[PDB]
C-alpha cells in the first residue's frame, strides 16, 4: 500500500524480468540482475541503507555464489574497523567536550568582530570535521552559528546570516574530505583500493585546502553584506580540565602515529594494516586512560554505517566472482577506447557530484566504488584514480537538503528558500567539477 | 590513582613476569601469558570486556601469532550475525508491544487471585526470556511486579513480596537457558562448537523445563504467605493493532524455520550457516513488512557482546595456534585420568556456577569455553559436552547481585536484603550443580 513497499515490488518485478529475459552466460545475467536490484534500492532508499547492505550477502549465498561464512567475513574487513576507532576518538572527544572548547579558544580570538567571526566559524567547523563527522560536526555547530547571528539579527537582512549557514553546512561537507576518517566514502575507497591513512591525506588535505576557500568566495560574491556587525560573546567560558589535555594528548598520539604510519610500521617489522590497530590502539588507550565510557563509544559508533561498508565490499566480490566485472569493461571497452582519459574523468567527476544531490554521500559511494573499480581492474589500470575521485566527488552535495544531512539541518532553520541554495550549489557543483578533474589530471605523474 | 589502572597495571607486570620467566617453548609461553592476561581482565572487569575482547586481537597480531585481517575476520563469524538477527527480532516486537500484550492477555486470564498471579508471573517472564535477553526482559518486568504487588502492599509482610521479585529475577536467567538467542554464553558455545539453533534447544528447553519448577519450589519452600491476596488490574487494557499479528506472524515464520531448519535446508540444497541466513532474512521481512525501523536495532543490538563474541573467537584459535590447548592437556592428562568423568563433570559444573557469582555470565562463557573445548579437543573428545555445560551453568546465578543485572535489577527496588538472596542462591546453586551433572550424565549415550 506504501510507495517504498511498490518500489521493492517493482524491484522484484525488474530483477525476475532481467533474470530471465537477459541473454547471456548465466553467472553474469545472476550478476547484472543483482547489480540492478541493489543500485535501485541504494538509490531510492526504499529500504534502509543498512538492511539493503545486509540483504547483499543474503542474496550472494542463496544463488550460489559465495558461502554463508565467505560472504559474511566480508564485514570484518580491517577499514571497518579503522572507522570504528575514528567513532571512539570522535565520542572521546565530545563526551570530555574537546570540541566545545576549540570552537571558543578560536572563536574568541576574534575580539568582537562578525567580519572574523563567520570566517573564524567554517575554519573550526572543517577543521573538526576533518576528525568526527559530517552529520555530527553540523548538529553540533548550529547552535554555536545561530549564537552569532543574533546580534545582526534582522532577518529582512537574510544574506547576512543565509552565507554562515550554508557556509558551515559545506564546511562540514569540505572538512571530510581531508582524511581517511572524517566521511563514509573514504573509508569505502580505501577498504576497495587498500589505501593507507596518509594515503588518502595526501589526496584529499590538498584537495580540502584548496576547495574551502573556493567554496567561501563563490558564498562571498553572490549576496554578502557582513562587513558589518559586532559580537555577543553570551555563555560561561571554557578551560581544560581533567585530561582534556590527556585526550588532545591520545589524540595527538593516535595522528602522530597515523601520518608517520610508514616508517613506523617499516621500522617495526612491517604488520599488516598498520593504521586499524592504530585505530584500535587508540580505543584502548582512550579506556585504559580512562577518559571515555563504552556506553558513550557504543551510542556515537554508527554501526549502521560500519555494516554499509561490508555490504558494499560483498558487492564489490560479487561483480568479480561472476565475472560481471569483466563484461562490463569489454561492453564499455569501444565507448572508453574512443573517449579520452580527460573526457573519462570530466564524465565520471559530473556524473557523481550531481547524482549526489539526490541520494546519500555513502549509499552512492557505496554503488558506484565496486562498479567502477572492479571494471578498472579488467582494463588493466590502477583502480585507485576513479575511486578516490569517486569519493571525493560523492561529499560534493551542495545543491538541494536531502542531498547530505548537514544540508537538511541548517535548512530546517526555517529561514533558507529552496531556490536559493538549489543555484549556489548549481555554481559550486560546476566549480568543483572543475577542481577535481584539474587536480585529477595533475595526480597523473 | 584508580583501583582498575592498578588492576591492570599489576596485570601488565604479571604478563611481562610470565613472559621472561616461564620455562617452556616460546609458543607455549605467550600462550600462557596472554590466556593469564586476558584472564585476569574479563574476570575483574578492570577494562570493559568488549574494549578486552579488542585487545585480544590487537595482541594476537602484534605478537606474530596471526596476521591483522585473520584475527579481525572472527568477529565476523555466522553465530555473531545469527544473535544480531535475535536483537533486530526482539527491538520489533518491543517496539510494536507484542511483549506487553503477551503479559496482559496471560495475566488476566488471572480473574483476580494472587495466588495464580505470580505463577502466571514467572511462565510469562521465562517465556519472554527465551528470546529478549535476561536484562531486558527483568527491566520490563519489574514494574508489571510492582503493580501486582501493591494489594498486599504491608511491607512489614515482606516475603509474599520478596518471593515475586527474586522469582522473575531467577525465571529472566533460566528463560535465557531454552534457545540459541536469549542469552550470550549460549551463542558462544554454539560459534565454538558448531551448533545449529535447533540443537542447543534440545539440550536447553528441557532443562529449562526442569529448572523453572524446581526453582520456584526452592523459593515457596522458604517464606511464603502468598495464598492470600486479590488483584488490582489497574491500567488501560491491550489490543492487537497494525500488524502485531503481523510480528507474531513474522517471528512465528522464523521459528518455524529454526526448529524445521534440518530438513527444510536438506531438502533446499544444503546451504552453509541455515540458522544465520534465517535470522538474516528476519531482519529483511521485519523491514519490508516495515514493522520496525533501522534506529530501534541499532539502539536495542548489544554491539557490545557482539564483539566481545570474536574477541573470544580469536581467544579460541590464539590458543590452538600457539599449541597451549595441548600443552594444557598434557599438564592435565595425568589428573583427568586419575578422575572419573562423572568426577571431572561435578567439578566443571560447580566452579563455573559459583565463578558466574563474582562476574557477568558472558565474560566466564568467553573466558572458560575456548580453555576448555579446545583442551577437550586435544584429549580428542566431542568439545559439545563441555561447552553447553558451561553455558549453561554460566547462566546459574543466584547468590549475590552484580552476577547478573536481572540480580542488579530487582535489588535496586531497595527492599531486597543482602543475606536474603545469598542464601536463597546458595540452595539453588547446589541444586543445579545436581540437576545439571545428572542431565549431563544422562546426555552421553
Ligand atoms: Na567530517
Ligand atoms: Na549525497
Ligand atoms: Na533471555
Ligand atoms: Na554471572
Not at 587498500?194 to 576547495?211: E, Q
Not at 604488520?271 to 584500535?280: I, P
Not at 573517449?339 to 580527460?342: D, K, N, P, S
Given at each position: 500500500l506504501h510507495r517504498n513497499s511498490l518500489i521493492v515490488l517493482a524491484d522484484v518485478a525488474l530483477f525476475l524480468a532481467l533474470y530471465?529475459?537477459?541473454p547471456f552466460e548465466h553467472n553474469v545475467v545472476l550478476g547484472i540482475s543483482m547489480l540492478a536490484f541493489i543500485a535501485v534500492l541504494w538509490l531510492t532508499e526504499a529500504l534502509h541503507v543498512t538492511v539493503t547492505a545486509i540483504l547483499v550477502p543474503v542474496m550472494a549465498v542463496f544463488f550460489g555464489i559465495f558461502e554463508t561464512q565467505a560472504a559474511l567475513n566480508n564485514f570484518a574487513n580491517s577499514i571497518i574497523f579503522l572507522f570504528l576507532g575514528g567513532f571512539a576518538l570522535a565520542a572521546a572527544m565530545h563526551h570530555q567536550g574537546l570540541d566545545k572548547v576549540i570552537a571558543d579558544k578560536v572563536l574568541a580570538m576574534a575580539q568582537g568582530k562578525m567580519s572574523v567571526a563567520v570566517f573564524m566559524?567554517?575554519?573550526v567547523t572543517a577543521l573538526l570535521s576533518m576528525w568526527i563527522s559530517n552529520t555530527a560536526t553540523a548538529a553540533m555547530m548550529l547552535p554555536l552559528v545561530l549564537g552569532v547571528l543574533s546580534k545582526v539579527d534582522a532577518d529582512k537582512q537574510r544574506s547576512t546570516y543565509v552565507f554562515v549557514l550554508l557556509g558551515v553546512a559545506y564546511s562540514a561537507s569540505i572538512g571530510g574530505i581531508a582524511t581517511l576518517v572524517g566521511t563514509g566514502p573514504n573509508a569505502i575507497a580505501?577498504?576497495?583500493?587498500?589505501?593507507?591513512?596518509?594515503?588518502?591525506?595526501?589526496?584529499?588535505?590538498?584537495?580540502?585546502?584548496?576547495?574551502?576557500?573556493?567554496?567561501?568566495?563563490?558564498?562571498?560574491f553572490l549576496l554578502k553584506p557582513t562587513l558589518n556587525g559586532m559580537f555577543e560573546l553570551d555563555r560561561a567560558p571554557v578551560n581544560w580540565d581533567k585530561g582534556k589535555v590527556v585526550t588532545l594528548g591520545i589524540f595527538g598520539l593516535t595522528v602522530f602515529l597515523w601520518i608517520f604510519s610508514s616508517p613506523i610500521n617499516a621500522a617495526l617489522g612491517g604488520?599488516?594494516?598498520?593504521?586499524?590497530?592504530?585505530?584500535?590502539?587508540?580505543?584502548?588507550?582512550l579506556s585504559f586512560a580512562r577518559v571515555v565510557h563504552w556506553k558513550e563509544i557504543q551510542k556515537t559508533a554508527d554501526w549502521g554505517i560500519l555494516l554499509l561498508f561490508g555490504g558494499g565490499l560483498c558487492l564489490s566480490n560479487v561483480l568479480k566472482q561472476?565475472?560481471?566485472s569483466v563484461f562490463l569493461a569489454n561492453a564499455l571497452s569501444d565507448m572508453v577506447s574512443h573517449?579520452?582519459?580527460?573526457v573519462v574523468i570530466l564524465v565520471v567527476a559530473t556524473f557523481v557530484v550531481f547524482l549526489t544531490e539526490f541520494t546519500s554521500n555513502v549509499a552512492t559511494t557505496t554503488l558506484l566504488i565496486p562498479v567502477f573499480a572492479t571494471v578498472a581492474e579488467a582494463f588493466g589500470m590502477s583502480p585507485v584514480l576513479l575511486s578516490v575521485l569517486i569519493a571525493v566527488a560523492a561529499s560534493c552535495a551542495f545543491m538541494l537538503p536531502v542531498a547530505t544531512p548537514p544540508n537538511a539541518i541548517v535548512f530546517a532553520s526555517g529561514h533558507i528558500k529552496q531556490?536559493?541554495?538549489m543555484r549556489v550549489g548549481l555554481y559550486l557543483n560546476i566549480a568543483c567539477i572543475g577542481l577535481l578533474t584539474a587536480i585529477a589530471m595533475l595526480f597523473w605523474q
Open positions: 530471465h529475459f537477459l566559524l567554517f575554519g580505501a577498504a576497495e583500493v587498500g589505501l593507507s591513512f596518509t594515503d588518502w591525506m595526501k589526496f584529499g588535505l590538498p584537495t580540502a585546502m584548496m576547495m574551502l576557500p573556493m567554496a567561501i568566495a563563490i558564498l562571498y604488520f599488516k594494516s598498520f593504521d586499524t590497530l592504530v585505530a584500535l590502539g587508540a580505543i584502548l588507550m561472476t565475472g560481471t573517449m579520452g582519459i580527460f531556490s536559493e541554495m
